[PDB]
Amino acid sequence: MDVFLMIRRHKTTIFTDAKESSTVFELKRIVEGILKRPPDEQRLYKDDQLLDDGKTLGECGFTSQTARPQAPATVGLAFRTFEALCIEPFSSPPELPDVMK
Amino acid sequence: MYVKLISSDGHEFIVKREHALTSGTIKAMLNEVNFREIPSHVLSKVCMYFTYKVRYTNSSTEIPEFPIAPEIALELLMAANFLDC
Amino acid sequence: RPVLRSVNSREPSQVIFCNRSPRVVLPVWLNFDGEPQPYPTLPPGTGRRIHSYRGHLWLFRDAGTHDGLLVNQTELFVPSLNVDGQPIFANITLPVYTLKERCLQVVRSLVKPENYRRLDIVRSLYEDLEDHPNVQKDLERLTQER
Amino acid sequence: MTEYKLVVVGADGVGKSALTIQLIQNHFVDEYDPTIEDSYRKQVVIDGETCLLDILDTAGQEEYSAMRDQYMRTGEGFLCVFAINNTKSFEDIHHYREQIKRVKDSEDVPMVLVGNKSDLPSRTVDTKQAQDLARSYGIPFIETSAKTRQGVDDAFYTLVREIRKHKE
Ligand SMILES: CC(C)[C@@H](C(=O)N1C[C@H](O)C[C@H]1C(=O)NCc1ccc2cnn(C)c2c1)n1nnc2c1CC[C@H](CCCN1CCCN(c3nccc(-c4noc([C@@]5(C)CCCc6sc(N)c(C#N)c65)n4)n3)[C@@H](C)C1)C2
Ligand SMILES: Nc1nc2c(ncn2[C@@H]2O[C@H](COP(=O)(O)OP(=O)(O)O)[C@@H](O)[C@H]2O)c(=O)[nH]1
Ligand SMILES: [Mg+2]
């Protein structure tokens, strides 16, 4: 029922949750309340797939098995022409010490 | 209400205020909190624990194991020790 | 003397132990003197109809690491009398560990105790890694929290 | 020369001592002291194998000490005896099996359910009830009479075979 996501654009990541039955447009309204941009100026992606406003999150591929609180699914976000999706990568951990194999 | 957490490398993580209060160190400081001691890949993992805690505390369903990759274990331990969570 | 102990009721009570955790559960019974007494373990996802008594105290730990576990959302399980012979259910799950304690568990499972102090961490954490889960110590904390 | 450690349990007066003495000494004791607990050894040929049977005829009041727990822990097989003319002895069987499971740290312990005094007409426990109890436990149920020697060798030899299947 509940899918847990992290919406990412540039160096911004939004941890939020939504209902599997809720639509992509309803998720853009959630982003609107945070980033102060209306849904008409937002483009949401799952990997490299542009999400249609009318489809539910479950129909896009977000399920309880793939969008867990401890492992949220990544949703790309683009703002308006529309900009190309850009997600700045996180930092990298150091090499694993030999004491940890 | 939401809280914004800044990593040491300038990543911005927006989480629900209730989720951020899971940390004792963030609770003491409290809209925006800057951490020069936590990188982005660690602070992102920390936020996953926040939603994990709030979701599964007093849960009537079974609780899954919180996963921790060996490569992030040592840094995550230091973060959690600093954040008191 | 110890407050956390079983009551010598001698009144049987049918209980179902159900391991809804990914760990091997070690059921621990606090006898009439407050001492922990281990009982046969439960592999993950396994149930077991056990024979207990009213007023007896139970806690559950990870059989290999003694990591703490929860029963019916709390630390202790005390079965009362069965109502019309229906069994009293004991749902054994993981707790929501603190992130620091979960990290300690994962580092403890990866590094050998001799090489604990070879890690690139703070000296304070070297002591936290060596302070393995302890049933007797958790009983003192639960006795004081009472 | 293989050895099998057998323990005969059940309520007082069900015939534990009479069943044991009938197996080793081949006679029926009408009044054996309910207090004397002893172990008996006998060389027997069971399915062609010569075995030493070490039979513990338990007696006395309950004692849930570590020392009594460990003594019973050494038994490889258990004869759980009740008397067909005593319902309470049948009702106690569940408790005796539960204590066997505890000390053996297992739920798959070689044991046999024994309904003794089958020569008596005053039946109070039905054979179907005992068959159903044995089925739920997954153990054989044998009707015995230490007085007529009915099923006596069968009860003890079957427990030995349950140990052998368990030892493989
Ligand atoms: C003292 C504890 C045993 C304890 C207890 O049971 N707990 C504590 C936790 O609640 C769980 C529960 C428990 O372990 N469940 C069993 C179990 C099994 C598997 C699993 C797996 N997971 N889990 C969680 C498990 C739990 N406990 N606490 N309160 C009491 C008890 C014990 C019973 C007390 C009331 C008994 C009253 N009787 C008086 C009348 C006659 N009766 C009698 N008369 C004479 C002798 C015996 C007798 N019985 O057995 C034996 C033998 C010889 C055979 C056989 C092996 C052993 S070993 C040993 N020492 C023996 C002896 N003497 C025996 N002979 N019986 C019996 C029928 C009733 C009330
Ligand atoms: N009719 C009959 N009586 C029996 C049988 N076995 C034992 N008894 C009687 O039951 C009484 C108690 O038996 P006992 O050997 O002392 O059983 P225990 O207390 O369990 O060891 C004795 O007086 C026996 O004569 C049997 O198979 N048939
Ligand atoms: Mg006797």
Numbering used by the authors:
A (entry chain A): 1 to 80, 84 to 104
B (entry chain B): 17 to 46, 58 to 112
C (entry chain C): 60 to 205
D (entry chain D): 1 to 168
Text of the article:
Kirsten rat sarcoma viral oncogene homologue (KRAS), a key component of the pathway, is the most commonly mutated oncogene and is a key driver of tumor growth in several human cancers. Proteolysis targeting chimeras (PROTACs) are heterobifunctional modalities, which recruit an E3 ligase to a protein of interest, resulting in subsequent ubiquitination and degradation of the target protein via the ubiquitin-proteasome system. Here, we address this gap through the development of heterobifunctional VHL-based PROTACs capable of engaging and degrading KRAS­(on), thus addressing a wider range of KRAS mutations.
Separation of 4 into all four of its diastereoisomers was carried out by supercritical fluid chromatography (SFC) to give PROTACs 5a, 5b, 5c, and ACBI4, which were profiled in both HiBiT-KRASG12D and HiBiT-KRASG12R cell lines. We consequently aimed to determine the stereochemical configuration of ACBI4 and rationalize what was driving cooperativity by solving its ternary complex structure. We crystallized ternary complexes of VCB-PROTAC-KRASG12D-GDP and -KRASG12R-GCP with ACBI4 and solved the cocrystal structures of both at resolutions of 2.19 Å and 2.85 Å, respectively. We observed that the overall binding mode remained the same as previous PROTAC analogues for both KRASG12D-GDP and KRASG12R-GCP bound structures. At these resolutions, the stereoconfiguration of the isopropyl group could not be unequivocally assigned from the map density. Based on extensive knowledge of the stereochemical preference of the alkylic side chain at that same α-carbon in high-affinity VHL ligands , and our ternary structures of compounds 1, 3, and ACBI3, the α-carbonyl stereocenter bearing the isopropyl group has been assigned as the (S)-configuration in our refined structure.
